[PDB]
Amino acid sequence: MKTPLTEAVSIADSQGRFLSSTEIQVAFGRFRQAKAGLEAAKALTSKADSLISGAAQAVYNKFPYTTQMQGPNYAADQRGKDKCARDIGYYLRMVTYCLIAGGTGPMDEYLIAGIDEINRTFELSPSWYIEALKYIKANHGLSGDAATEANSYLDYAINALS
């Protein structure tokens, strides 16, 4: 679980050492950033339904075949649309977790690890998800550090898919 506090402890322990000024500076950096990050998680959470449905439509508009082809890996029916909205909601929810923890840890453990096998196995296209992520990025309406950190996690996800 990659977060400032967690890795600080982990490194000290792997070295059999007590925490020193280095790990304390790590915590300082974390607690300072937590203010912009925690507020960012809130902003994203309040616009969740909007961001999710908007991201879904952006994907449907860029890849029209996804609301037409009848295969189970697509969203031509209501079942597929819910799967898609659900998935996109998952990505958004992981982003809020990352902001809360101040690291990619939540996303790495619950979503990224294994996603390749899932997309391949169920024939889901990474490009669909990337488009959804670009949309959230362009419409979360954040600014300041909040924007930078949230975008860092959205781009992280994009990188993990390409």
Instruction: List the end-to-end C-alpha distance of the chain, in Å, as a whole number.
Output: 22
Helix 126-139 / helix 78-101 crossing angle, nearest 10 deg: 60
Provide, rounded to whole angstroms, the least separation between the CB of residue 37 and its own copies: 9
List the one residue from 21, 78, 159, 162 that touches ligand CYC (CB under 6 A).
21
Nearer to another protein, 64 or 72 (CB): 72
148 contributes a contact to ligand CYC by CB under 6 A: yes
Among 1, 24, 48, 118, binds ligand CYC (CB under 6 A): 24
Q: Is 103 in the site for its own copies (CB under 8 A)?
A: yes
109 binds another protein (CB under 8 A): yes
126, HSE (Cβ side, Cα atoms, 13 Å): 12
Helices and strands (H, E) in the chain, number of each type: 8, 0
Crossing angle (nearest 10°) for helices 21-46 and 4-14: 150
**The one segment of 27-35, 41-49, 80-88, 89-97 that binds its own copies by CB under 8 A:** 27-35
